[PDB]
Each structure stands twice: as structure tokens, then as C-alpha cells.
């Protein structure tokens, strides 16, 4: 019932332009939990099953079976955006703490928050 | 000439729904410089002149005197998104390193990172 960091929602990302990821697809909540409770928006990262294995240090793999996907997929920590919460359709699952640690790490690389 | 972290571009964020920020407005590039050089997208954070003082730990102020702005503004590190580079029109300015340290900090607060 509350939006928590690490939750996997199905959400409507369209319309998009060019290389932006759109459609209705799984996304992961990456905003801190204070913003998730009180802000009118959430910050998410997109999941695509267009690749099933990672090719980039900012990519994180999600098992299809464990996290209720149709296909083995990957979190694109380079494809992130702020959504009005009305964009969140369905909450599918939520990531393990160890998967959120790989997500934290990939977000630091993608956003230039470490060294490098 | 290359897109750099800390560069402030004019970009088209439209169309949006509800509480998402849209329009054609300044943004600060927050993606790393390896990604800014080779990927077809950048990650930006939106700037508003609807407020001139910060009200949230994920807000960072920009002063009209230092940067090519229309008004004293504030960076909203909760309104961030990935944009295809064709969405970037003009390069306006770039932030100081000291101002970028405040950006990093609010980004760690905004995104639930502590390291």
C-alpha cells in the first residue's frame, strides 16, 4: 500500500522520444522513502527484456522467475525518470536487499557520484 | 562542444502529466562523462524559476548573477529524467565545482544513497 524504494511497479512511460524507453513496462522505485510517502512524484529506473544479460556497468540483471517478469530482463540505471504517481499501475514484486545494493552501485556510476 | 556533467542546457521536457516538470527550460546534466560522450541519452535534473529559495534537502540554489539565468533559480534533484540528446537545444552555462558538490549531495539524498 505504501510506495517503498526497491518496489517493482508496472507503469506507463509513454510518450517518449528517440532512445527514451516507453510503453507500459516494469520500473523500479529508486527515490528515497521520505519522497515516496510525501512527494507527489516518484523516481524510477526502467526495466527492459530487450536484453537478458547486462552489457554496461550501469546495467543490473533481474531473474524472470524471482521477480515476476515475462522474460529475463535488466534494470537500466541509465534510463531513469520522475513520474507523477498516477503513472503507477500495478506493483509486481520488490527487489532483494542485495539486488538494491547492485542498483545503488550502478546508480553511483551512472550519475558520477563516486570516482572514475 | 562535448556534453559535460555540470553543463546547463535548454531542453524540451514536454509533454508531461501532472506533477512532472515539462516545458522548454534549463536543465543540468547529471550523467557521468563516459556516458555523456558515447550513449545517445543524457540524464538531466530540471531547473525552475517558480521559486528562488530552496525548501527541501534535494533543492540547490542557482544565482542569476553567476549564471546566464533569467531569475534566481533552484535545481530540483527530485525532478530528474533521461533525455534523448535531440531534446537539447542550446548550451547556456555550466556550474562551478563547489556548486556541483551540492548537486551530488542532494542527488544522494534524493536517490537514497549514503556512501
Amino acid at each position: 500500500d505504501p510506495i517503498r524504494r526497491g518496489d517493482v511497479y508496472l507503469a506507463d512511460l509513454s510518450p517518449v522520444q528517440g532512445s527514451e524507453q516507453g510503453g507500459v513496462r516494469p520500473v523500479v522505485i529508486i527515490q528515497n522513502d521520505t519522497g515516496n510517502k510525501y512527494s507527489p512524484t516518484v523516481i524510477v529506473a526502467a526495466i527492459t527484456g530487450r536484453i537478458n544479460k547486462a552489457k554496461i556497468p550501469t546495467h543490473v540483471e533481474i531473474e524472470k522467475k524471482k521477480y515476476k517478469l515475462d522474460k529475463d530482463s535488466v534494470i537500466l540505471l541509465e534510463q531513469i525518470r520522475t513520474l507523477d504517481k498516477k503513472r503507477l499501475k500495478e506493483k509486481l514484486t520488490y527487489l532483494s536487499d542485495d539486488k538494491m545494493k547492485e542498483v545503488d552501485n550502478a546508480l553511483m556510476i551512472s550519475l558520477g557520484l563516486n570516482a572514475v | 562542444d562535448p556534453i559535460r556533467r555540470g553543463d546547463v542546457y535548454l531542453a524540451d521536457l514536454s509533454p508531461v502529466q501532472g506533477s512532472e516538470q515539462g516545458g522548454v527550460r534549463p536543465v543540468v546534466i547529471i550523467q557521468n562523462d563516459t556516458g555523456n560522450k558515447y550513449s545517445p541519452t543524457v540524464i538531466v535534473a530540471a531547473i525552475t524559476g517558480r521559486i528562488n529559495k530552496a525548501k527541501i534537502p534535494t533543492h540547490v540554489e542557482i544565482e542569476k548573477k553567476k549564471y546566464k539565468l533569467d531569475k534566481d533559480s533552484v535545481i530540483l534533484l527530485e525532478q530528474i529524467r533521461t533525455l534523448d540528446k535531440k531534446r537539447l537545444k542550446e548550451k547556456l552555462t555550466y556550474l562551478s565545482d563547489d556548486k556541483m558538490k551540492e548537486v551530488d549531495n542532494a542527488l544522494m539524498i534524493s536517490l537514497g544513497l549514503n556512501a
Epitope: 544479460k53 547486462a54 556510476i109 572514475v116 | 563516459t34 560522450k37 545517445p40 540528446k85
Partner: nanobody, 131 residues
Framework: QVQLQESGGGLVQPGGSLRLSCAAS????????IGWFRQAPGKEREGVSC????????YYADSVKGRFTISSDNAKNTVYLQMNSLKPEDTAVYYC????????????????????????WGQGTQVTVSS
């Protein structure tokens, strides 16, 4: 379906030069980055150069900077690698590869150790540098 046919290899003298070609077939040329890997007997497969479709941004491994040059002919769907000042340590099998992330991944491999699989691979062309 997707095929990368290379060529241009052969024996060269140290200090000599060559121009390799990579002809790309069954994909959208502007939606994929094409580049060059190399592997010498017994040793490791290293990425050499890469060129992204739109923006034309290039990558070069450190050991061939100033000496190699990658370029593309969007009409012929062909990538070129012009190798100058050839040294014998350049002697290897040169493969061109193609992937959506081939270029940003190779640039990242200068900062983070990784081991990522890329989609499409050529057959390889022998490049021997010897007196």
C-alpha cells in the same frame, strides 16, 4: 541474418600500414555501434576501436592512439580501420563486432573491469607484423 564480413589483413613490415574493412549486413547501420577487437596467440582479446552511428563519436584503446583511425561509410554500411606505424605487438586476429552498447561499453572498460558479451561478431582477419 546479421553478418560482419571483414578483410584487409595480411603480412606487413614494422612501420608499415594497413586498412581493414567491416561490411555489415542484416541490421540497421545507424542503430548499432561497430568496432574492432583483437587477439594475439595465447593472449587476451582486447577492444581496439569503435564508432557509434549517430554523433560519430570514436573510441580508441590506449595502445593504438594516434596510430589507428576508425571511420564509417554510411552508404556502404562499412567500417574502416586505418592502421599506421604498425608495430609487431599489433600482430593478431582482428574481429569486428557490433552491438547497441559496443561503444559505451568499451569506453567504460577503461574505468571498470568487466566482461560483457556483445551481440554480433565477424570471422576475423589475420594481421601479421614481421621483418
Amino acid at each position: 541474418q546479421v553478418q560482419l564480413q571483414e578483410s584487409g589483413g595480411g603480412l606487413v613490415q614494422p612501420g608499415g600500414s594497413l586498412r581493414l574493412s567491416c561490411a555489415a549486413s542484416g541490421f540497421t547501420f545507424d542503430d548499432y555501434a561497430i568496432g574492432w577487437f583483437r587477439q594475439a596467440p595465447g593472449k587476451e582479446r582486447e577492444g581496439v576501436s569503435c564508432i557509434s552511428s549517430s554523433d560519430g563519436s570514436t573510441y580508441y584503446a590506449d595502445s593504438v592512439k594516434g596510430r589507428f583511425t576508425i571511420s564509417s561509410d554510411n552508404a556502404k554500411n562499412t567500417v574502416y580501420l586505418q592502421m599506421n606505424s604498425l608495430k609487431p605487438e599489433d600482430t593478431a586476429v582482428y574481429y569486428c563486432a557490433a552491438d547497441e552498447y559496443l561503444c559505451t561499453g568499451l569506453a567504460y572498460s577503461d574505468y571498470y573491469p568487466g566482461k560483457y558479451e556483445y551481440d554480433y561478431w565477424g570471422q576475423g582477419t589475420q594481421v601479421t607484423v614481421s621483418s
